[PDB]
Structures are given as C-alpha cells and as structure tokens.
Design a binder for this molecule. Structure first.
Ligand SMILES: *C1=CC(=O)N(CCN2C(=O)C=CC2=O)C1=O
Ligand SMILES: *C1=CC(=O)N(CCN2C(=O)C=CC2=O)C1=O
Lengths: 258, 258, 257, 257
C-alpha cells in the first residue's frame, strides 16, 4: 500500500519500543535505530529481533540501523539515506538525544563538557539537518526531538546537562518555526521520572522499594510515568492527527516541570 | 456498564461537538452543557438534538444542561450536582471559558473590565471549585480548562483579555499542582486561529478568502486549526491514556504562541 | 528647577519610604499615597510626618494622599488629578498593589476571591488607566507596578493570589508594549522574602529560629532589604534606563528564577 | 583603603567602555580584557590607551589583558590568575560572550555550528569556571554574563545562534542558583537593537531609512545606548542589589518581552 514511515532512534530502549508498537497500529512503517545484540547487552531493553516479530504482526515493515554515530553529520546523513532507500519517504521522525551527566558545576571536567555538547546539541543539530530536507520536499513532515524536562528548569547539580537541554529546546523552537511554512512540525518533549530500566538503575530505585517511594514523592503526581503514556503523547505528535503545533516544548514529568 | 463520565461545557460550539464524538468513542458517557435551541440560535453551531443522536450511536448516554450561569458559584455547583445525580461520577471535565474583547487599553470601559474578569477568571475559579471535589474523593480525575493562546503572549490591543487569560493559566498551574497528590490532573489549553464559525466571523473571514489568506499568513503553519485536531489533543488529556501531566499550559495556535 | 515628579502608593510602608528617599536624591518631586496616622496605626511602619522632614532635607516637595480607595476608578482618577494639580506633571509612577491571601484552593471563600481580584487586578487596571494618559501626552513616562514573585510561579496554597499576580504581570506586559511607541515604560516587579514588618509578622519570624528557616528557603540564604529593592525600583523610574518595557522582574533572592 | 575589583571582558567594545567608567565612579578597581591596538584595528571602538587615562581620572587602577583565548579553559584560567596577582581579589565580573551568526538552519555549515558553540557556550562554561572559585572562597561575588536577547525567543534565521544563547541562559540559571549558597550572584543580560558600531554596521544602518526601519521593529521605537546598558549592568555588579541570582534580563526595548 502507501504506508507512511516513522524513524525512531535509540529504539532498543526508552520510549522507542512502545512508540514503535503504537506507530505501527497507526499504520506506519518503521525505521528503528538502536543498539544491536540481545537483552544481555548494555542499553538494550528490548532487542531488535524481539521487536521485528511483534511489529510484523501489526503489519509493519521494519528496517534496523545500528552502525551510525548520531553525534556526527555523517552518521545522521547516512541514516536518512538508508531510510529513503528502503522506503522512499520520511513522514515522521522521533530523535531521542542526550546522555545524563550530573555533579557540581566546578567539578565538571572538559570531557564532561565535550560529551554533553555532543549528546545534547550535536545530536539535535545533525539530527534535524538530516530529517528536514526529505520533509520540506514532500511538503509534509512531523518531528519530535526528545530532550529533557531539565530543559525547562536547569537546576543545581545539573548545570551543563540542563543548560544544553535548554539550548536544544531553543533550537527546536527556532527550527520548528523556520520550517512551519513548508508544512512540517518539529517539537520537543522533555521527560523525567520515567518508569524504565534506565531511570530505575540511575536513581538506585531498582530493588529498593523505599528509595522508589522517595523518588515518587518528588513527582507532583506521586508516581513514575509509563512508556505507554509517553508513547501515546509522542505518537499524537507524529501520526498526522495534530498538525497545529510546532516549535514547542512539552514537559512530561508528572508536573515536576510545570 | 461502568463507563466513565466526561463533562464538556459550551458543547454547542467550539471544540464541544467534536470532543463529544471522540470522547464517546473512548467509551465515555457525556454531560454536555451549552445553549438550547436549533442551529439558527446565536452561539449554536451544532444543536443539542443533533448530538444525542450521534452520541447514542457510539454508545454514550448524554445529559443536557442549559439553565446555569457558569460565571457564578451556583451555576457551576448546580452543574456538578446534576452530573453526580444522573451518572454518580465525574472522571473528566473540559471547562470552556472566556469571552473575547479587544481594543486599546485606555479605551476599555468598566463594563468590559467586569465582563472579562467574569468570563476569563470567575468561570475558571467556580468551575474548578465545582469539578474537583468529586475527583479528589475518587482519587483520580482529568481536567482541561480552555483559556486562550493569548495567555502566553498578552499583546497590545488584547491587554485585559490576554492578561486575565494569563491569570487563568496561572490559577490552573497552582490548582493542577495542588491536587496532583490526589491523582487529579488539571491542565490548560489555549488556542487561536481555529477553523470554526466563531473565529471565522470575528476575523471577518467567513466570506472574503483573501482576508482568510491574510489570516493564515499570520500562522507559522499557514493554516487554521480544525476542531477534529483540537478534540484529539484535548481527548488525550481527558481519556486516561496520559496521567503524567498536570498544571501545564499547552499552546494550540499553529506555532503562533511558541 | 522643573523637577520630574514620582508617585509612590502605599508609601507609608513596604518599599515606599526607602524609594522616596532615593527618588528624592535623584532630584524628583514626590506624591506619597499611604495610610494616615502615626506609628501605632496598623499598616504604618514609617509615619507620614517623618518622611516630609527627611524628604525636605534632600530637597523635595511631597504631596500626601490618604483619602482614596485605589481599587476603584474614582480613587485612581482622583489621585492623578491631584498630582497634575500640585506639580502639573507625572513622569514616574510606582503602583504598589495587592494583598496576600493563602490557603487550600477548595477552602477559598467567595469573599477571598472578590478581594484578591480587587487588590491584585482592579488596582492595576485602574492604577494604569489613571497614570498613563498624562505620560502619553508628555511623550515620556516610566511606571513600575508591584505585583508578586508568586506571579512567576503560582504554587499550591497560593492559587488565587499567585494566579491573579500572574494576570497582573500579563496585563503589565501588554500595557507596557502597547504604549511603548509613546515613549513610556510600564514594567512589573514582584518580590518575596523581604525584610520588613509586613512579611516578618506574617511568617512568625519576628523567633530567630523561624527566621533562619525562612532564609533557608531563599537561594541566597537571606532576606532582601528595602534599600536594595528601592535601588532596583528607582533604576526603572529615574530615566537612566529607557530600553525596558512590558517586562516582569523577579526579586526574591533567586526563589522565582 | 580596599578598592573592590571588577573584571570586564571585550572592554574595547560593547558595554565594556561605558561600564568601566561607571564602575570606576562606584569605587572599583578594573581589569579590562579586549583586543589590543588602536581605533583602526577591527573590533576596537574605544582603544585601550584612551581608556586608562579616563579611569585613572576617576580614581581606578586598571590592568589590561589581550593575550588570552576566552573560548578555552586556559585563557580564562590565566585571565583570573592575573587578576588575583595584580589586585589579589575578584568581586565582580562582566563576561561578554558570543559571536553573531544568522541564516537558514539547513544552510549552516559544520564550522558555523562549531564556532557558535565556542562563542556562545564554551566562553560561558570556561568563564564561570574561572571567576567563580575566587568569589566562593571570599563568600561574596557578583557576575553578569552577556548572552543575547535572542536567547528568550530563538527565532527563524537565528536558529543555532539563538538556540545556544538559550542554553547559555540555562547554564547561568543553574549556576546562579547553585552558588547563591556561597553569597555569589550569577545573572544574564541579553540585549538587541543597540547603538554601537557593531550592530549599526551589521544591519546596514550606518542609511537613515534602514535605521528608521530598524527602530520600527523596536516597541520603544529607539536604539539602546551603552550608557543605559552600563547602568543596568553596574547595578548588578556594584553590591547594591544582592537579591537576584540565576536570572535572565531582556534589554531590547521590549523586543524580547
Ligand atoms: C579542555 C576543556 C574542553 O572542553 N576541551 C576540549 C575537548 N578536549 C578534551 O576534553 C581533551 C582534549 C580536547 O580537545 C579542552 O581541551
Ligand atoms: C459567590 C462567590 C462570589 O465571588 N460572589 C460574588 C461576590 N459576593 C460575595 O462574596 C458576597 C456577596 C457578593 O456579592 C458570590 O456571590
């Protein structure tokens, strides 16, 4: 048929898997970027193989990509070329970016500063510069850049991480408005306090019911957000249902960033 | 059998009709407040009688209410009283509020100041004071207060209207955070440049396609928003699929308020 | 000497007294609205009579106004009429507005709602509609409206107070932009954690242990002084800065950053 | 006597010259970083030499620095090393950062992206990492980082410039809150539509019709002067205001309101 194509990076963890499932139910074809290997590999919460079988049952064709560095121009340009080759179209793109670094500002090394710029900014710059040309040509496109809820409140101990996330949102706003007249939407979603293996291990909430209660007590809604909730909101900005929002940052942290 | 209940005010125009259809598709019973009469009556784009026919097809019981002053405590208290009588529960509420007024700040009469304070603030204060107790008791609830996109950018010629909309969003942020510990979400949507007869006639664009073209020229996405899109976004905050957002204001103006 | 004139409401308390002194030192004539009486009167931290003696020493004429209700159109229209009489000009206006109310949102009575709308909004609407025509005509004016730092972050327990302070800031933004082409600036300043009898008595700090707990909530770990707030406020009213209009400035030690 | 010390980078242009004068008048010793040479050298609107004469008249000792790369850790660490050598103390710092780049987002080369990351961010990260340790040990300090008014509204055609300026403000907010604890304040001032040879030449206004069209985009319908900017900047560095940290102040005549 004429199914549309969604691209989801880091799709072996975080929101990617759940987003891929519902995006398939919306009738999409999927190009998943992620980490190769099985569940025993680090950063692999749902293996590529495990998804392909389930997404096929939803009727989805899936192309997997795992040999690109998304902090560089080449890695992102090569990713989009391999999408347009397999499917000939790019309608939706969900670019998951960033890598967490915390600590005192005066304790930040030059390597931490170089890494946070590469993951929070270079990923967005080269990511958008690669997904926008195919959409501007087709006259229609939808893009969600996944930054961080700290972008709306860069706090102590999160200076260079929150600050660059604030810069990524600012870029998304400018880019979202610059290409609005071509009929493409670029929006940012910043989350925090999400219930997935990454956040659970980072906050030491894994296995400790008390520490998890303490982490939840920091959320106004007194809970951790679920991937199915995030995927639903994310898919709503990438499935063609909403076409009147661009250049905006949506906080998804249970009220923490209100 | 155990179908949640959604309250939608002003449901004879604006997002009400379209929201009622999709909310019924999410499996919700409805209580529609609005203006009684037929299509010829002022402020009735979709009459009551036409909707209960459609909403019953989708499987929704409907209660109609049209004899209340939503700018007063009594009107809103009576609305919720009659909701808890017919269905015995209030899971979601969509409180459309406000009435447009523009002009130079120094030209604003004391009547305009009194009316903008009643439609932009009194409706929100009394509306939220009414719908919140049933949800706090239930330990779960989703509320969307419709203010205006001008609340994010109170501009010249819209001083008192936009300013009080900024206050309504401010109330929504505080209320949304204050009751998040009870499982209740309260969020604000503020639109502009919508495709419905209310804005179409106010912008003098119901006919003149050149005036409509110069109107869409002010929207970054170069078009007017449809009610089917707004109902989709609004339903996402009222159907139980997203329970990790509260106290937040969402712009829906094609990037105008980004 | 054709000295510009500054109007300062609520001037018997809060920033009013300290702002008048510096404003005088910058060569201004003063119109002080405030509560009449002595120090034993409620709401009077620095009595009227005390300020005229000092304000005169700094070389300043002061007109005292105390018989207006600033929540009404007549109260503010009368105040400005009496300014344009004694001095015939209005260059700077500092409109202290608002009145605190806190508590659970669902506990808020209809009277608390009507009062916070009168003090946080009506004072701003009528206060601005009164001071602006005289400046728009002169082609130059500078106005600072005092809202609250809660306007920037309306939090639980301060729903209707902080929410209406947000609306006041919103009004101040549109008004400051709308009349910028006439060369008049309208900006808002919202403070919190100030060191003066008003805040000091409401937080039960007037108990060094409680006061230390108060300041622990401030990022700069201290309370702000009126001399500091007068300086920042006078900077937006002395003509030195004329490139800022329609903006809100948090002044809470970083609490509202 | 113990004259306090203020550091001002890029002091051969922008606010630097005018800020130097008023901060000298406020009883501050100075350390100016800038580009050495005469008025013929690019980027020198007020030559070094012409300044040292004036600040000396206002009673200020001034140490000059022109051999550091402020986008690197070494240049900043050396600049502050030489400040604590000549004067033994750092009380105030005005870190002017950034370099303008505009154009379509999809036309931006990897060199522009690299250059704007270095001028809008690396200058801030290394600037604050250098000036902050001396003030934390002193228990008091005042910093003002100069970003851009585009940080508050990163618009089309200013994608990666305004976006990185927004990240610079985000860092300033976190840093200003993280060290308020130690009695130091870090705040941001982002300007636009200023009357100095830099902006005048970029917008081709140095044509009265283009200048008038430029002032038409400003709500206050005028261009800001360095004497105005220095007043606001000095107020955040002279120890008068000590109740604001981690905040971003727009200074564009209301353009970023
Ligand atoms: C020092 C701080 C910094 O960010 N850089 C640039 C990146 N980098 C390293 O961290 C090591 C070598 C290098 O180029 C500095 O050099
Ligand atoms: C109930 C809530 C409200 O605001 N009002 C109007 C104001 N009012 C009082 O609070 C008491 C008398 C009155 O008019 C309500 O009646």
């Amino acid at each position: 048929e004429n199914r549309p194509v969604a691209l989801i990076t880091m799709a072996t963890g975080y929101v990617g898997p759940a987003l891929a499932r519902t995006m398939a139910d919306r009738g999409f074809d999927l190009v998943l970027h992620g980490t190769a290997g099985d569940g025993t590999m680090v950063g692999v919460e749902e293996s590529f193989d495990s998804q392909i079988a389930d997404l096929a049952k939803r009727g989805a064709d899936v192309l997997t990509i795992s040999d690109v560095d998304l902090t560089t121009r080449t890695g992102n340009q090569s990713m989009i070329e391999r999408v347009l080759e397999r499917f000939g179209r790019l309608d939706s793109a969900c670019l998951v970016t960033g890598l967490i670094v915390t600590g005192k500002f005066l304790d930040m090394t030059c390597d931490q500063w170089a890494k946070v710029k590469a993951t929070n900014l270079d990923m967005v710059f080269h990511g958008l510069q690669a997904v926008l040309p195919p959409m501007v040509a087709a006259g229609a496109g939808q893009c969600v850049v996944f930054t961080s809820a700290t972008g709306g409140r860069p706090d102590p101990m999160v200076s260079i991480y929150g600050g660059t996330r604030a810069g990524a949102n600012g870029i998304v706003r400018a880019v979202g408005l610059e290409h609005a007249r071509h009929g493409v939407q670029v929006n940012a979603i910043g989350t925090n306090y999400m219930d997935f293996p990454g956040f659970l291990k980072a906050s030491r909430a894994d296995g400790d019911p008390e520490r998890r209660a303490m982490i939840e007590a920091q959320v106004p809604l007194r809970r951790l957000g679920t991937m199915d909730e995030l995927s639903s909101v994310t898919a709503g900005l990438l499935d063609g249902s909403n076409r009147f929002q661009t250049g905006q940052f949506f906080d998804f942290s249970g009220g923490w960033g209100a």
